[PDB]
Enzyme design. Structure first.
Site, PDB file in Angstrom:
ATOM      1  CD  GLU A   1      -1.683   2.369   1.512  1.00  0.00           C
ATOM      2  OE1 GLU A   1      -1.805   2.628   2.740  1.00  0.00           O
ATOM      3  OE2 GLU A   1      -1.194   3.161   0.674  1.00  0.00           O
TER       4      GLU A   1
ATOM      5  CD  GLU B   1       3.076   8.765   1.837  1.00  0.00           C
ATOM      6  OE1 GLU B   1       3.707   7.748   2.262  1.00  0.00           O
ATOM      7  OE2 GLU B   1       1.859   8.953   2.032  1.00  0.00           O
TER       8      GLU B   1
ATOM      9  CG  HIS C   1      -6.016   7.278   5.173  1.00  0.00           C
ATOM     10  ND1 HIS C   1      -6.149   6.106   4.450  1.00  0.00           N
ATOM     11  CD2 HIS C   1      -4.705   7.601   5.120  1.00  0.00           C
ATOM     12  CE1 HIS C   1      -4.974   5.747   3.978  1.00  0.00           C
ATOM     13  NE2 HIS C   1      -4.078   6.628   4.378  1.00  0.00           N
TER      14      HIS C   1
HETATM   15  N1  LIG Z   1      11.517   2.597   0.416  1.00  0.00           N
HETATM   16  C1  LIG Z   1      10.896   1.947   1.403  1.00  0.00           C
HETATM   17  N2  LIG Z   1      11.349   0.794   1.920  1.00  0.00           N
HETATM   18  C2  LIG Z   1      10.721   0.143   2.934  1.00  0.00           C
HETATM   19  N3  LIG Z   1       9.608   0.608   3.523  1.00  0.00           N
HETATM   20  C3  LIG Z   1       9.082   1.785   3.087  1.00  0.00           C
HETATM   21  C4  LIG Z   1       9.688   2.505   1.986  1.00  0.00           C
HETATM   22  N4  LIG Z   1       8.963   3.595   1.776  1.00  0.00           N
HETATM   23  C5  LIG Z   1       7.947   3.559   2.624  1.00  0.00           C
HETATM   24  N5  LIG Z   1       8.026   2.491   3.405  1.00  0.00           N
HETATM   25  C6  LIG Z   1       7.077   2.120   4.472  1.00  0.00           C
HETATM   26  O1  LIG Z   1       5.894   1.790   3.832  1.00  0.00           O
HETATM   27  C7  LIG Z   1       4.788   1.901   4.714  1.00  0.00           C
HETATM   28  C8  LIG Z   1       3.597   2.464   3.952  1.00  0.00           C
HETATM   29  C9  LIG Z   1       2.275   2.457   4.723  1.00  0.00           C
HETATM   30  N6  LIG Z   1       1.455   3.297   3.951  1.00  0.00           N
HETATM   31  C10 LIG Z   1       1.567   1.093   4.673  1.00  0.00           C
HETATM   32  C11 LIG Z   1       1.814   0.230   5.912  1.00  0.00           C
HETATM   33  C12 LIG Z   1       1.143  -1.143   5.889  1.00  0.00           C
HETATM   34  N7  LIG Z   1       1.667  -1.945   4.778  1.00  0.00           N
HETATM   35  C13 LIG Z   1      -0.351  -1.060   5.809  1.00  0.00           C
HETATM   36  O2  LIG Z   1      -0.945  -1.387   4.747  1.00  0.00           O
HETATM   37  O3  LIG Z   1      -0.979  -0.722   6.838  1.00  0.00           O
HETATM   38  C14 LIG Z   1       5.277   2.772   5.866  1.00  0.00           C
HETATM   39  O4  LIG Z   1       5.290   2.012   7.077  1.00  0.00           O
HETATM   40  C15 LIG Z   1       6.675   3.218   5.430  1.00  0.00           C
HETATM   41  O5  LIG Z   1       7.592   3.369   6.507  1.00  0.00           O
END
Ligand SMILES: Nc1ncnc2c1ncn2[C@@H]1O[C@H](C[C@@H](N)CC[C@H](N)C(=O)O)[C@@H](O)[C@H]1O
Ligand SMILES: Nc1ncnc2c1ncn2[C@@H]1O[C@H](C[C@@H](N)CC[C@H](N)C(=O)O)[C@@H](O)[C@H]1O
Lengths: 344, 344
Positions: free
Chosen positions: A124, A133, A281
């Site tokens: 996501e 982002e 959201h």
């Molecule tokens: N380049 C990256 N490598 C690893 N994690 C990342 C990266 N960019 C963003 N994230 C993580 O991706 C997540 C994105 C969230 N929107 C989703 C969290 C979770 N998968 C959910 O569906 O609830 C966050 O926790 C970020 O810290």
């Protein structure tokens, strides 16, 4: 040096991963029922895309999507997370007795090592207006780990744009800015900064929802196919538009929303953030014109929305629009990094 | 490099000065009538402390306090500002025809060169709970430019703390943390993180106002004298307390506010953020205890509030409190950098 560090100012990255290190911020996303429930539905209803498969979860956060992949029968799930949330995900994997099946890997997906190639990538990575982002680039980057003919969930993303009329939103900017149009604020003439204040407010995309009646034309759609797209394709996003106006009035800007589709072997499941659908959201996003354009029903409003990626994990937005019948034109520059959160 | 860069993470500094570069944020402070009007009063009613004097304005923002020094007859005002707001201040100085008297100097007060020692330093460097932002250290640092027997406006700062009862606030924070007590959030047991979640939510000081009836004892006062204090004195701030409880009930935490005094040659003027006084943009701050302490009227609640400066321009707050009569104790760690803004 990685692909992530090369495209991202360290100061932006630090703040970004600090934010996602908060349980409260993971919770905010988790409690978006439309978001979390649709992901679970997409995954479980396409159980054959997960049963005995190898899975990568890009940015696993709490681990929630990896747990859904496990529920659908995945053999092995690599759960990659760059924030300190990775530690909390590990705790949950142990407490849910899934250590044999979910492997948390702390770090950026562009920097970590996976032991093997995967059948399917889940993530996501959507922000405001889809692209905020720049996490879609991390998701595309992760395709270096994808087996040939492997799948992506979500598979495609559609950005929608449509012209809107909202006189009250437009006027609100001048009202705020007119604080500066005071010749004696405690004896000080502030008026010289009124134009700079207006400019600052118009540069902020407006995050909130609205009634669909404000929309003046059928939306134009820009599609990103996550199976085929390259990271580099998201550095400069050019969205031409030719709107056939359904209503006469003053066009105050363009409204944006997005949908993603999970194109599985059993069924396609859609997650929509459209203003016709229950609120998420993500809300919707509106980019104002500093000068509105008058258009009549049957006119064509044409132009381009150009999104240029920046090193602060966001986009510089340029919108140029004209009413073809009169040649009346408006040109607008916005900073997607710093939206105005208007919803109440 | 500089005293500032040494004590400050770059990523914190970037975000900090970006924030203050926004006209909207300068406006937010300027429109606090109690704040802006009390500064103007302090300066103008002590006109003899400014008439034909040399002035330093530490962190001038829009320039507003420098304009007040000019109104009071200052000969020369060096207006130092590290954000891009410095450019807007320059514009106002020109449009107000004060180029002969106000000299904007862009940069950090710890890095710039002043041509000349000054008679008086003016600043508004107060944050939440007085100390947030660590700008009081920049203000004290600026004393390298102060003539012997020069003045500081404000001259002293008092932090007040008092125990409070607010069951509704307590339950609200606990309700949010208890999201992570669920054994089956979409089939996932989140309960292993419940303690970490409580810690995180309880780590956030609560910024809002309240009715004075929630206070359970007369406040304890900690004073910083800006004429005498060294920047190093603010690295570790130890505030012992002994409250004589006026009311029986559950103590849910400590409430904080602050006053500053402008001790001029003509009169002393006070700016108060107390809950007995009209509201300011600083509101008040409450640090919750994870577990409340029962106390009876006549009991003594004793302990220490320890503020330890961090590189994110803020403080790690440790509050240890005990009810002497029962030995009931509560120990709490809070992150002043990331408060919960509840007034919204
Ligand atoms: N380049 C990256 N490598 C690893 N994690 C990342 C990266 N960019 C963003 N994230 C993580 O991706 C997540 C994105 C969230 N929107 C989703 C969290 C979770 N998968 C959910 O569906 O609830 C966050 O926790 C970020 O810290
Ligand atoms: N070390 C520093 N050097 C220069 N300016 C600073 C420093 N730290 C904070 N500031 C600025 O100090 C200002 C703090 C504001 N509270 C005050 C603005 C203005 N003096 C007013 O009273 O309205 C912001 O504009 C910051 O950018």
């Amino acid at each position: 040096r990685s692909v992530f560090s090369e495209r991202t100012e360290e100061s932006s990255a630090v703040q970004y991963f600090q934010f996602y290190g908060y349980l409260s911020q993971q919770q905010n996303m988790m409690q978006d029922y439309v978001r979390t429930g649709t992901y679970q539905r997409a995954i479980l209803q396409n159980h054959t895309d997960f049963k005995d498969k190898i899975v990568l979860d890009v940015g696993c956060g709490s681990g929630i999507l990896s747990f859904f992949a496990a529920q659908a029968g995945a053999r092995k799930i690599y759960a990659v997370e760059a924030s300190t949330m990775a530690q909390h995900a590990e705790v949950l994997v142990k407490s849910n007795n899934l250590t044999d099946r979910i492997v948390v890997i702390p770090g950026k997906v562009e920097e970590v090592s996976l032991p093997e190639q995967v059948d399917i990538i889940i993530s996501e990575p959507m922000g405001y207006m889809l692209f905020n982002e720049r996490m879609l680039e991390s998701y595309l980057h992760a395709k270096k780990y994808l087996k040939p003919s492997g799948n992506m969930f979500p598979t495609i993303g559609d950005v929608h744009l449509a012209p809107f009329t909202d006189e009250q939103l437009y006027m609100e900017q001048f009202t705020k800015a007119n604080f500066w149009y005071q010749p004696s604020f405690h004896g000080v003439d502030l008026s010289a900064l009124r134009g700079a204040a207006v400019d600052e407010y118009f540069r902020q995309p407006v995050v909130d929802t609205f009634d669909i009646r404000i929309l003046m034309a059928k939306s134009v759609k820009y599609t990103v196919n996550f199976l085929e797209a390259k990271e580099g394709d998201l550095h400069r996003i050019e969205i031409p538009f030719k709107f056939h106006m359904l209503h006469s009035g003053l066009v105050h800007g363009l409204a944006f929303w997005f949908d993603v589709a999970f194109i599985g072997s059993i069924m396609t499941v859609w997650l929509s953030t459209a203003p016709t659908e229950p609120l998420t959201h993500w809300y919707q996003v509106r980019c104002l014109f500093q000068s509105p354009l008058f258009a009549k029903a049957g006119d064509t409003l044409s132009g381009t929305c150009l999104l240029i990626a920046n090193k602060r994990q966001s986009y510089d937005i340029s919108i140029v629009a004209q009413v073809d019948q009169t040649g009346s034109k408006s040109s607008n520059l916005l900073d997607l990094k710093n939206p105005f959160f208007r919803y109440t």
